[PDB]
Amino acid sequence: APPKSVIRWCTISSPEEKKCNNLRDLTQQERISLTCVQKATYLDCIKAIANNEADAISLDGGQAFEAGLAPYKLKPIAAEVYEHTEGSTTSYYAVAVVKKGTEFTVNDLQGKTSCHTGLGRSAGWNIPIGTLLHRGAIEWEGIESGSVEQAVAKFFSASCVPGATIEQKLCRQCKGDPKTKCARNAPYSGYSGAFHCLKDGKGDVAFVKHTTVNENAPDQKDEYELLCLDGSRQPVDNYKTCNWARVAAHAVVARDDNKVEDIWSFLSKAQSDFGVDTKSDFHLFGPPGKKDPVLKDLLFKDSAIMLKRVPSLMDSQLYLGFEYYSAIQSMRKDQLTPSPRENRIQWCAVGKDEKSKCDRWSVVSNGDVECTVVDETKDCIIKIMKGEADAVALDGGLVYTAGVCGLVPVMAERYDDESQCSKTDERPASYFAVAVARKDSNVNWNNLKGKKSCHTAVGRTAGWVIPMGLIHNRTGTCNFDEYFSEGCAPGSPPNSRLCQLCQGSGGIPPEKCVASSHEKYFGYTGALRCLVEKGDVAFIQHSTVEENTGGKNKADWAKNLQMDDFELLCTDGRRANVMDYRECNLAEVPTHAVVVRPEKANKIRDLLERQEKRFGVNGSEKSKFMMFESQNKDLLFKDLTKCLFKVREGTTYKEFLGDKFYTVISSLKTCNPSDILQMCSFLEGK
Numbered sequence: 001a002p003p004k005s006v007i008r009w010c011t012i013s014s015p016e017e018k019k020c021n022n023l024r025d026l027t028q029q030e031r032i033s034l035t036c037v038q039k040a041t042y043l044d045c046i047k048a049i050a051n052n053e054a055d056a057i058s059l060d061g062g063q064a065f066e067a068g069l070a071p072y073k074l075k076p077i078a079a080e081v082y083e084h085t086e087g088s089t090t091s092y093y094a095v096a097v098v099k100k101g102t103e104f105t106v107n108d109l110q111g112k113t114s115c116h117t118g119l120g121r122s123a124g125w126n127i128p129i130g131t132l133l134h135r136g137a138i139e140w141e142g143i144e145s146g147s148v149e150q151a152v153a154k155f156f157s158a159s160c161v162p163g164a165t166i167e168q169k170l171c172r173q174c175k176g177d178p179k180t181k182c183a184r185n186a187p188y189s190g191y192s193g194a195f196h197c198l199k200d201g202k203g204d205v206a207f208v209k210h211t212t213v214n215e216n217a218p219d220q221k222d223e224y225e226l227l228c229l230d231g232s233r234q235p236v237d238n239y240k241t242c243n244w245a246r247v248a249a250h251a252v253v254a255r256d257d258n259k260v261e262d263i264w265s266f267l268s269k270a271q272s273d274f275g276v277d278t279k280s281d282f283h284l285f286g287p288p289g290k291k292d293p294v295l296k297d298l299l300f301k302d303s304a305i306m307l308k309r310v311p312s313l314m315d316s317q318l319y320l321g322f323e324y325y326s327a328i329q330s331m332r333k334d335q336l337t338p339s340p341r342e343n344r345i346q347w348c349a350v351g352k353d354e355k356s357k358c359d360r361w362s363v364v365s366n367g368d369v370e371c372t373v374v375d376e377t378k379d380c381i382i383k384i385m386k387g388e389a390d391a392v393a394l395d396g397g398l399v400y401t402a403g404v405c406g407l408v409p410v411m412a413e414r415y416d417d418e419s420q421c422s423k424t425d426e427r428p429a430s431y432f433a434v435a436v437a438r439k440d441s442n443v444n445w446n447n448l449k450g451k452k453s454c455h456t457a458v459g460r461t462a463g464w465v466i467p468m469g470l471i472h473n474r475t476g477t478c479n480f481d482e483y484f485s486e487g488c489a490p491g492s493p494p495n496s497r498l499c500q501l502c503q504g505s506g507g508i509p510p511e512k513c514v515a516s517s518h519e520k521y522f523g524y525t526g527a528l529r530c531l532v533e534k535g536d537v538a539f540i541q542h543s544t545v546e547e548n549t550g551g552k553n554k555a556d557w558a559k560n561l562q563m564d565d566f567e568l569l570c571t572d573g574r575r576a577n578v579m580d581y582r583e584c585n586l587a588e589v590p591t592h593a594v595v596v597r598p599e600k601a602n603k604i605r606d607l608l609e610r611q612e613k614r615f616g617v618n619g620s621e622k623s624k625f626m627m628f629e630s631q632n633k634d635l636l637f638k639d640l641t642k643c644l645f646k647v648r649e650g651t652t653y654k655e656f657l658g659d660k661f662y663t664v665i666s667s668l669k670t671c672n673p674s675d676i677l678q679m680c681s682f683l684e685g686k
């Protein structure tokens with residue numbers, strides 16, 4: 001029985017409850033319905049909805065955490081948006097600002113004074129407080145050696161804070177009367193009084209809501225400037241790159257189940273009809289106006305423009321940002337039982353063949369290099385960015401998605417020899433993608449359709465990702481298994497048209513179209529064989545021909561063969577001569593890469609540099625183990641790797657790839673988006 005439900009919204013107070021029923025009537029005259037409740041607290045409202053006792057409730061980031069925590073583990077279904085300038089606002093950046101001419105960054109701040117707005121409030125407490133806890137700054141493991149209050153003393157020497165139930169070394173530079181000071185109500189805080197701290201010099205370090213140094217006084221600028229977590233420091237409007245946190249913007253949670261989208265539809269509709277534009281008696285976002293503190297941001301935040309949707313996958317750990325998460329993880333959510341301080345490197349293993357590979361190391365790395373194995377190679381991307389994982393060595397495409405998520409290359413591979421590594425003379429390496437056409441052949445990029453094709457596998461950059469990539473920009477939709485009359489592409493569907501060329505099994509079980517050892521048309525040469533025996537074209541490397549031609553591949557087929565029988569097929573028709581890989585290649589394909597996070601970079605390279613020669617190719621302990629080798633199969637690290645040098649500092653995946661590469665990789669996956677790739681992406685436009 002098809003879609004048609006009732007959405008029971010969760011409340012907090014009676015006045016907000018009353019406005020709830022006041023929509024009833026419409027929910028009624030409309031398809032999806034409602035049933036409003038009321039809970040004295042939001043924790044109750046959360047445990048309520050959780051136990052299917054209710055549908056959903058819109059929350060803040062400070063709560064959205066708690067809401068996402070177990071056993072609740074509630075999902076963020078849709079955020080709220082606002083009117084500023086930058087873009088289509090969906091957050092509120094958490095920064096920090098001090099006076100110009102500062103002789104420190106943060107690694108030595110274990111003594112200077114400070115200044116907050118109040119305790120347990122974001123930007124002020126929580127955030128910098130948590131960021132510092134997780135950045136080890138404040139030697140702290142649990143309140144019983146240094147409470148959130150205690151620890152302050154053995155970190156600070158001054159803090160202007162309204163929290164005085166226990167500690168004093170966090171109650172100093174607050175201006176005013178001798179009995180009205182450390183009170184949350186003292187005008188020496190909020191966003192201006194604490195901003196008055198650096199202004200009236202009463203406190204050295206002070207971090208508040210961003211862009212307040214604009215609301216306050218656009219004029220006098222550089223007397224104050226923002227300070228980054230990565231050594232750097234910058235000007236007034238330099239927050240979108242030098243802000244402590246990606247402080248979110250009120251979202252809408254819910255459990256994780258079938259009864260979900262209806263929650264999206266009973267609202268989006270409760271918007272398009274009865275929204276800010278509604279010509280009725282309701283303003284679903286609260287018209288910008290003042291009111292009674294009892295009735296503020298009711299049902300939904302009053303200072304909102306509209307509500308934007310949030311991806312299926314999207315969790316707390318993700319929606320609110322890493323920063324905020326890392327910050328608040330430093331708290332009493334757990335001191336260090338399910339979240340230790342293992343500063344040392346670890347790796348996203350992807351396979352039992354890989355985990356243990358990583359494990360094969362973990363003994364001979366005495367902690368210097370840890371492990372966490374995975375199932376889908378895409379688990380890597382989320383884990384690292386989740387802080388759970390540290391690094392990863394992946395293929396071309398995965399690098400794209402990653403970079404969109406915020407992760408980037410830090411130390412790429414080398415496929416020639418270390419005898420061209422530790423230097424900055426000729427950085428990248430030449431491996432090209434070519435459209436191998438036959439000598440007397442018919443084919444060409446202009447009559448390439450309806451041709452029998454030969455791909456290595458359903459996924460290798462040169463042997464697949466690129467063809468389909470270029471192809472996309474002239475395919476209608478990604479009906480790749482609906483272009484060539486047929487072909488072989490080991491890994492494509494069972495009885496598909498794309499496996500038709502696959503000569504499958506060598507004998508025994510009819511393993512056709514397998515990206516397995518058991519395949520005959522597997523790999524570059526396999527797919528080349530394909531061109532020779534069946535196909536009208538084969539997608540492979542620049543020097544894939546040379547490898548066999550010249551009397552090199554001494555097989556039942558190649559024996560004779562001269563590349564004087566193969567030709568390059570250029571995207572413009574030009575039947576280029578094999579030897580011109582440069583002037584007739586499909587794509588200049590990059591080498592793999594260790595994509596990681598913007599905060600552990602230069603030092604992660606180090607870790608790999610330490611172990612580099614320790615367990616590297618020309619390495620010393622070659623009698624113990626290595627790194628690239630693994631049963632003689634590419635495990636995380638391809639086996640055809642010698643150097644793995646520290647790349648260029650301050651680059652980007654877009655740069656790492658190349659326009660002619662990014663361009664097509666970006667616009668290929670456009671043709672068919674995906675979860676991870678979708679979540680990271682909507683977060684790009686925050």
Ligand SMILES: *[C@@H]1O[C@H](CO)[C@@H](O[C@H]2O[C@H](CO)[C@@H](O)[C@H](O)[C@H]2NC(C)=O)[C@H](O)[C@H]1NC(C)=O
Nearest residue numbers: 469470472473659660662663664665666667668
């Ligand atoms: C195929 O890729 C893109 C996407 O279809 C085509 O055009 C875009 O290419 C890049 C984005 O992927 C951008 O740099 C271009 O500016 C963009 N085009 C426009 C009008 O903005 C591109 O033409 C195709 N590739 C080639 C080589 O033609």
